[PDB]
Design a protein around this nucleic acid. Structure first.
Length: 159
RNA sequence: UACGAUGAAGAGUUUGAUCCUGGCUCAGGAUGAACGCUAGCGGCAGGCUUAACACAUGCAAGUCGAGGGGUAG
């Protein structure tokens, strides 16, 4: 899209030990989405916080992905692991709300979902839970897509 | 592009820094509740969870003369 809004999930300070002393450094994770159909996460590493966030959003502006969000939310229930984390997304209604964790909430608000229930029965690492949410969101295929893949009309997949 | 289902949130903490497993704690609801501070009412509900420990005193199961002898009065 064109009206991309960013959201900083977490900023973590790292350190590399050298002969002299401690070499600090800032890492930031930023998810930027059009709030309607497309979203993308990025990682930025620098020495200043503003520079790290700028590098993160500049890297996240690339490799955007399209996600089906039938009606107002996910079409079906889906699991996504990506190693440590384990996210489970379920559609609820058209007025429920986004019941998500700490880092899943930002992704689900940037992709454009407004009523979903997500349970993170796993780790609490912002680096891995965002990618787990992405893996659980990219495996979703809508009714038209499954009907076209099967070859059957869009009435037998319902009846 | 319908059907039913009105329903599921995390965070801190081991390390110079990272990921994982893993334990502790917190954010919510509730009570025959107690304690501290405070204090204007109305409706309704509740009130010895412990010693089935020991009890002063009052009341808590009587009625029928259309069953009977019927007495004081």
């Amino acid at each position: 899209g064109l009206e991309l809004k960013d959201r900083l999930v977490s900023v973590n300070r790292v350190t590399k030990v050298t002969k002299g002393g401690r070499a600090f450094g800032f890492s930031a994770i930023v998810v930027v989405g059009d709030e309607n159909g497309v979203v993308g996460h990025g990682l930025g590493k620098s020495k200043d916080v503003s520079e790290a966030i700028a590098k993160a959003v500049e890297d996240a502006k690339k490799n955007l992905v399209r996600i089906p969000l039938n009606g107002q939310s996910v079409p079906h229930e889906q699991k996504g692991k990506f190693g440590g984390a384990r996210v489970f997304l379920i559609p609820a209604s058209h007025g429920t709300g986004v019941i998500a964790g700490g880092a899943v909430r930002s992704v689900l608000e940037s992709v454009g979902i407004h009523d979903v229930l997500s349970k993170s029965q796993g780790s609490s690492n912002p680096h891995n839970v965002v990618k787990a949410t992405f893996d659980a969101l990219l495996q979703m295929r809508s009714a038209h897509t499954v009907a076209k893949q099967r070859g059957v009309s869009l009435e037998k997949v319902f009846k």
